[PDB]
Design an enzyme around this catalytic site. Sequence first.
Site, PDB file in Angstrom:
ATOM      1  N   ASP A  69      -3.328   5.209  -2.771  1.00  0.00           N
ATOM      2  CA  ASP A  69      -4.265   6.471  -2.427  1.00  0.00           C
ATOM      3  C   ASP A  69      -4.240   7.479  -3.035  1.00  0.00           C
ATOM      4  O   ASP A  69      -3.026   8.127  -3.380  1.00  0.00           O
ATOM      5  CB  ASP A  69      -3.626   6.631  -0.753  1.00  0.00           C
ATOM      6  CG  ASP A  69      -4.728   7.722  -0.240  1.00  0.00           C
ATOM      7  OD1 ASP A  69      -5.474   8.335  -0.907  1.00  0.00           O
ATOM      8  OD2 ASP A  69      -4.202   8.025   0.977  1.00  0.00           O
ATOM      9  N   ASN A  75      -9.710  -0.313   7.975  1.00  0.00           N
ATOM     10  CA  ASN A  75      -8.610   0.412   7.928  1.00  0.00           C
ATOM     11  C   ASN A  75      -7.975   0.213   9.599  1.00  0.00           C
ATOM     12  O   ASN A  75      -8.540   0.829  10.278  1.00  0.00           O
ATOM     13  CB  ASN A  75      -8.736   1.764   7.509  1.00  0.00           C
ATOM     14  CG  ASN A  75      -7.246   2.819   7.764  1.00  0.00           C
ATOM     15  OD1 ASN A  75      -6.373   2.101   8.091  1.00  0.00           O
ATOM     16  ND2 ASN A  75      -7.547   3.970   8.030  1.00  0.00           N
ATOM     17  N   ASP A 132      -1.217  15.857   5.457  1.00  0.00           N
ATOM     18  CA  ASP A 132      -2.119  15.103   4.779  1.00  0.00           C
ATOM     19  C   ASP A 132      -3.529  15.782   4.369  1.00  0.00           C
ATOM     20  O   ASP A 132      -4.625  15.334   4.890  1.00  0.00           O
ATOM     21  CB  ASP A 132      -2.321  13.754   5.461  1.00  0.00           C
ATOM     22  CG  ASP A 132      -3.114  13.005   4.407  1.00  0.00           C
ATOM     23  OD1 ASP A 132      -3.240  12.893   3.468  1.00  0.00           O
ATOM     24  OD2 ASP A 132      -3.953  11.710   5.077  1.00  0.00           O
ATOM     25  N   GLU A 141     -14.139   3.438   6.205  1.00  0.00           N
ATOM     26  CA  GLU A 141     -13.259   4.314   7.167  1.00  0.00           C
ATOM     27  C   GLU A 141     -13.822   4.346   8.450  1.00  0.00           C
ATOM     28  O   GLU A 141     -14.829   4.954   8.500  1.00  0.00           O
ATOM     29  CB  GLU A 141     -12.917   5.561   6.336  1.00  0.00           C
ATOM     30  CG  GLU A 141     -12.161   6.568   7.451  1.00  0.00           C
ATOM     31  CD  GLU A 141     -10.512   5.972   7.853  1.00  0.00           C
ATOM     32  OE1 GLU A 141     -10.335   4.794   7.549  1.00  0.00           O
ATOM     33  OE2 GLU A 141      -9.952   6.827   8.476  1.00  0.00           O
ATOM     34  N   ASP A 162      -6.411   9.855  -2.750  1.00  0.00           N
ATOM     35  CA  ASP A 162      -7.403  11.134  -2.155  1.00  0.00           C
ATOM     36  C   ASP A 162      -8.544  11.124  -2.662  1.00  0.00           C
ATOM     37  O   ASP A 162      -9.415  10.224  -2.841  1.00  0.00           O
ATOM     38  CB  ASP A 162      -6.458  12.353  -2.016  1.00  0.00           C
ATOM     39  CG  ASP A 162      -5.179  12.309  -1.148  1.00  0.00           C
ATOM     40  OD1 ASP A 162      -5.202  11.365  -0.307  1.00  0.00           O
ATOM     41  OD2 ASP A 162      -4.436  13.343  -1.076  1.00  0.00           O
ATOM     42  N   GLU A 191     -11.963   8.711  -2.081  1.00  0.00           N
ATOM     43  CA  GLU A 191     -12.811   8.800  -1.041  1.00  0.00           C
ATOM     44  C   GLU A 191     -13.826  10.051  -1.535  1.00  0.00           C
ATOM     45  O   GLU A 191     -13.667  10.985  -2.367  1.00  0.00           O
ATOM     46  CB  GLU A 191     -12.134   9.272   0.132  1.00  0.00           C
ATOM     47  CG  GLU A 191     -11.068  10.403   0.298  1.00  0.00           C
ATOM     48  CD  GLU A 191     -10.074  10.469   1.137  1.00  0.00           C
ATOM     49  OE1 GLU A 191      -9.488   9.398   1.454  1.00  0.00           O
ATOM     50  OE2 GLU A 191      -9.683  11.450   1.661  1.00  0.00           O
ATOM     51  N   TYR A 236       0.913  -1.381  -0.010  1.00  0.00           N
ATOM     52  CA  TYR A 236      -0.025  -0.100  -0.048  1.00  0.00           C
ATOM     53  C   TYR A 236       0.867   1.244   0.010  1.00  0.00           C
ATOM     54  O   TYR A 236       1.511   1.375   0.720  1.00  0.00           O
ATOM     55  CB  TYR A 236      -1.025  -0.001   1.156  1.00  0.00           C
ATOM     56  CG  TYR A 236      -1.718   1.212   1.420  1.00  0.00           C
ATOM     57  CD1 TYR A 236      -2.792   1.450   0.646  1.00  0.00           C
ATOM     58  CD2 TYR A 236      -1.684   2.116   2.722  1.00  0.00           C
ATOM     59  CE1 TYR A 236      -3.367   2.665   0.705  1.00  0.00           C
ATOM     60  CE2 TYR A 236      -2.331   3.252   2.654  1.00  0.00           C
ATOM     61  CZ  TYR A 236      -3.193   3.627   1.976  1.00  0.00           C
ATOM     62  OH  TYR A 236      -4.065   4.593   2.179  1.00  0.00           O
ATOM     63  N   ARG A 270     -13.903   4.711  -1.139  1.00  0.00           N
ATOM     64  CA  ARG A 270     -13.760   4.813   0.121  1.00  0.00           C
ATOM     65  C   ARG A 270     -15.050   5.944   0.644  1.00  0.00           C
ATOM     66  O   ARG A 270     -14.885   6.915   0.106  1.00  0.00           O
ATOM     67  CB  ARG A 270     -12.295   5.364   0.429  1.00  0.00           C
ATOM     68  CG  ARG A 270     -12.443   6.004   1.988  1.00  0.00           C
ATOM     69  CD  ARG A 270     -10.693   6.202   2.415  1.00  0.00           C
ATOM     70  NE  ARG A 270     -10.866   7.278   3.402  1.00  0.00           N
ATOM     71  CZ  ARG A 270      -9.660   7.622   4.234  1.00  0.00           C
ATOM     72  NH1 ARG A 270      -8.884   6.914   3.955  1.00  0.00           N
ATOM     73  NH2 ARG A 270      -9.717   8.289   5.240  1.00  0.00           N
ATOM     74  N   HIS A 314      -7.574   3.654  -4.266  1.00  0.00           N
ATOM     75  CA  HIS A 314      -8.845   4.108  -3.323  1.00  0.00           C
ATOM     76  C   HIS A 314      -9.002   5.637  -3.598  1.00  0.00           C
ATOM     77  O   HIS A 314      -8.065   6.462  -3.206  1.00  0.00           O
ATOM     78  CB  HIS A 314      -8.965   3.563  -2.033  1.00  0.00           C
ATOM     79  CG  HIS A 314      -7.791   4.210  -0.936  1.00  0.00           C
ATOM     80  ND1 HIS A 314      -8.062   5.433  -0.334  1.00  0.00           N
ATOM     81  CD2 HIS A 314      -6.843   3.844  -0.520  1.00  0.00           C
ATOM     82  CE1 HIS A 314      -7.084   5.836   0.458  1.00  0.00           C
ATOM     83  NE2 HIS A 314      -6.219   4.668   0.475  1.00  0.00           N
ATOM     84  N   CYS A 341     -13.562  27.690   6.052  1.00  0.00           N
ATOM     85  CA  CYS A 341     -12.259  28.420   6.141  1.00  0.00           C
ATOM     86  C   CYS A 341     -11.513  28.173   7.626  1.00  0.00           C
ATOM     87  O   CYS A 341     -12.396  27.904   8.501  1.00  0.00           O
ATOM     88  CB  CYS A 341     -12.821  30.119   6.238  1.00  0.00           C
ATOM     89  SG  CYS A 341     -11.231  31.227   6.278  1.00  0.00           S
TER      90      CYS A 341
END
Lengths: 281, 280, 279, 280
Positions: free
Chosen positions: D82, D201, D55, D179, D84, D111, D41, D149, D109, D119
């Site tokens: 991943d 996960n 992230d 998730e 995103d 999501e 992964y 995901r 994956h 903001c």
Amino acid sequence: SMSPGKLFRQAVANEHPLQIVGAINAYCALLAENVGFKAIYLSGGGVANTLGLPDLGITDLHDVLEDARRITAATHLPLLVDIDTGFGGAFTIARAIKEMERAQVAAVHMEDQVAQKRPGKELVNTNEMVDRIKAAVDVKSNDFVLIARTDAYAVEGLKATIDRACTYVEAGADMIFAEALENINDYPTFCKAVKVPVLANMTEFGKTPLYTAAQLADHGVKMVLYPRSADRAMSKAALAVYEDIKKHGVQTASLPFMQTREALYEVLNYHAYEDKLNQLF
Amino acid sequence: MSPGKLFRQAVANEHPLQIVGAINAYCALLAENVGFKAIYLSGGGVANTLGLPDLGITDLHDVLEDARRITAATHLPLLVDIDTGFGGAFTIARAIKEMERAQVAAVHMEDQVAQKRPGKELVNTNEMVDRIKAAVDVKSNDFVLIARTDAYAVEGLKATIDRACTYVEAGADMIFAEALENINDYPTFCKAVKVPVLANMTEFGKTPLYTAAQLADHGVKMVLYPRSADRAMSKAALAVYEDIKKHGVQTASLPFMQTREALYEVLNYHAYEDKLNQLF
Amino acid sequence: SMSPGKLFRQAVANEHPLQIVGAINAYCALLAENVGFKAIYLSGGGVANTLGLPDLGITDLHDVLEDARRITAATHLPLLVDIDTGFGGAFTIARAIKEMERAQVAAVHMEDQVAQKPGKELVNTNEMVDRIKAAVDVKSNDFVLIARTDAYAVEGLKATIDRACTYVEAGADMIFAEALENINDYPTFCKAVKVPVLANMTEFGKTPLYTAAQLADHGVKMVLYPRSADRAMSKAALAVYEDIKKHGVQTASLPFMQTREALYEVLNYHAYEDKLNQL
Amino acid sequence: SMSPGKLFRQAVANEHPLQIVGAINAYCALLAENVGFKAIYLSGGGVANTLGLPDLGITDLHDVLEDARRITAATHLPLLVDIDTGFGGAFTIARAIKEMERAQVAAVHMEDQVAQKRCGKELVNTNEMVDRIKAAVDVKSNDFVLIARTDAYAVEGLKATIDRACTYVEAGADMIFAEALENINDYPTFCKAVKVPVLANMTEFGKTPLYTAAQLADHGVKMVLYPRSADRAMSKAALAVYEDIKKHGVQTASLPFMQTREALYEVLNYHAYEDKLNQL
Ligand SMILES: [Cl-]
Ligand SMILES: [Cl-]
Ligand SMILES: [Cl-]
Ligand SMILES: [Cl-]
Ligand SMILES: [Cl-]
Ligand SMILES: [Cl-]
Ligand SMILES: [Cl-]
Ligand SMILES: [Cl-]
Ligand SMILES: [Cl-]
Ligand SMILES: [Cl-]
Ligand SMILES: [Cl-]
Ligand SMILES: [Cl-]
Ligand SMILES: [Mg+2]
Ligand SMILES: [Mg+2]
Ligand SMILES: [Mg+2]
Ligand SMILES: [Mg+2]
């Protein structure tokens, strides 16, 4: 001696106006340098189209950064780089500024269009563009040049556009890119209002008519951009060669339209390489 | 079909296969549009576009990046110039594997020395065999290795044929016969090496220009036009730059530019406006 | 507002000695910065091994340049970068120097081994001078070229000193003395080649391990720890993998993991939430 | 012989469950392969944090693609990557899928979070996620695996999450990434509902508690992900070495915690290189 940003600033100050020509690759940059231009431009549309993608913000920081690095590696001519809307949120913009600085770029332009996709020309609220600008200004060095580009003229008219540009300058923008003003006599008002140097986009096959550098300078414009001029001619010339070879089985007919091997060596400064190739051996 | 297989099929079915150089993805699309069956990434092109001379200064990554961009945009089989293999046996192996991964159809590797008294200097036959073995040991079956010999100018036709034949025995799929000066050398050469032969029809060289048909008649399977488009592009660009510089506007260049309409056609732009309305 | 080269030079001057620690990636560089090191190192062997390649000069300018860019993007700590033999001839070397400068690197080391090949083969002294000249001709003043000699094992101390001295005369800023076996060789060596000297304190080598203090006492200006962290990382990773494999869960590995909290600290994460509210 | 997608599919079918371990680089992938894992992964958070970025979807297709290429270059072990939220609109997603395929990736994956927000955590409308999925499915090969995901459990609760997942499957998703389900006894309901393979996960220091592979398989789970386990241990170990060297002026104390040079050579299969070093 001077930083890329400083060189650009100096070119904008000294030229009346500064013509900035688009070059899609390092070699084109050298050709432009050879002809005697004082600044060069990396077109976002160019970066995309060259990859075979449409100019729809599909490209990211890396697509542009790579093309920019190649150019600045080959010439010290100050390069203006199109960073679209900044490739994402505030952190992406900051990254873009830092990376372009590291890549020895002189200046970027960022515009006030919307980015996202799940009616064609939609703009962000003034505040959002200020946010974009602040993100950029907060991490930029002094010398480096941020050009804020507004796409507001066609949609919102002259007054709204001037308002935006002015707010952008107050938000930290160094210079203004006035996209597609239709009447030459709008520029003197616009330039006087925003105080900072203004760039006019003299692209072909647009809605804007073609004015001369001289004409635009006379109306208060500091920079004239020719974003895709060379690229468009290159594409036609390439297609012609391909067609010639295809139809005739040989390129004889294309020969007069090709740059000589001699000129190529001149542009590459090739003789300077053979000098060092024998000096050590 | 795999990229290698597509190239092989193009070499079999065309008489001969014209392979045109394209420096970037867009040029590849133009070539595809005109109806070419194979395209070429020039090592000299990769270098010169960066503003470097064609002296093996570029490495696997310089070429690989340019190759990836092209194969991303078209399924047309791409032949990629890998110079001398960028280093020793391990570098060559890496180059082959990376080009395969990048969806490249074929590479050509030559028997010159790496970065070398000015001239063309060749490696011993054995060293070129070593280079070839390194490549063959990691290559898939479909993928095409073209061994290029630069030996004609230096060593004459017989020595060149000898090399080429050894290269074929070492595992080379096809042969690139660089700068044969006489059309009537090809029939001897092609008959001797048995495998498909590529002729380099570059302009402004030592070689004169023959037609595809002429070369096919003399036993040639592939004709390469490595820099033809690039050279025309460079002149056209320079002209635009000069026009803008001299006249303060590009009016005079306008007839020499591709229309916005043609650009959209090549990019298949209407297919993007289809999804732009389907989502909104 | 000092240049990377100047920062490195200053670190070499002020520390007794300057410890330069290897980091394979940007995050490791941050960890090193956090612990308070004044300079960091990009190992050529590291660049290769991380890709799963042996340290046999298979990697090129781009493999190294990419890893270097990532690091310098994340910290201003002066970075020393291993450029092996210069990736090719004189033009490649020139390119390497220019690209490393552009990538905000502080210093490179280039060695006198051959590119092509149970022992080391060296190039003739003259060839290494050629390599050095190629580099020096395009380098800025501030930027640091460290000439590395691999000659001790092959040719013995006197021949090595001779080379190093010639390298300095050819324009080398500093000297990397690879694999001197006896601490008492350094004082002779350092006095001879009057420029700062780097000692390579790699583990599991032919060299034994001396302390920074010990090496400084024998005239050494820089001590390099090229793969120390990397080696520990690899063992730790393998352990986690084995734990997960054997037990079906990582419970046993939990005490050996960096906390999520510490991660945020190193990334300076709070500074991102600051900008998330400021706009 | 078999495609990366097919290999992943086969690993999901044959293992009960398939443990997928995160590796940040090619070498880690080799270590994982060595220990005998069947799939690996590439963590999006890993890609970012390793660059020293949070992230927060700051990384783009290229940041991830580069890291993915490095790994797949070194091992044929099927890699899950991943991506995103897909890095942009429908065109970016399509590009991402195509590029990952080209990079010899087995599975991605994607999501249902928003990309840019305000903001705790904001999701896109079901419809928007379907749009994302369609963009991906329209260009993906059959073998290649799209894992949708959903981050909806924490925000919207189990029933809403199941609804989404089911819609995602109907939209063309191959498998589902659930998730942060907080209760083991949610899985059997969830797995039965969304009939495709489900990934759980098992990250540390999350909201989720740690269950065993066996436990999760018993509750109907097909894949268990260990996204950052190795990375976290590496970071601590590195810090320790740095501190040792700093405090003590030598690394003596760290030596027991280091991988031997011998083990390194084993993992790199170094003897295979000395074979070619003597054959030449
Ligand atoms: Cl377009
Ligand atoms: Cl250059
Ligand atoms: Cl103002
Ligand atoms: Cl050339
Ligand atoms: Cl594309
Ligand atoms: Cl034969
Ligand atoms: Cl090694
Ligand atoms: Cl960063
Ligand atoms: Cl001296
Ligand atoms: Cl984070
Ligand atoms: Cl590998
Ligand atoms: Cl269902
Ligand atoms: Mg643009
Ligand atoms: Mg070539
Ligand atoms: Mg090294
Ligand atoms: Mg992620």
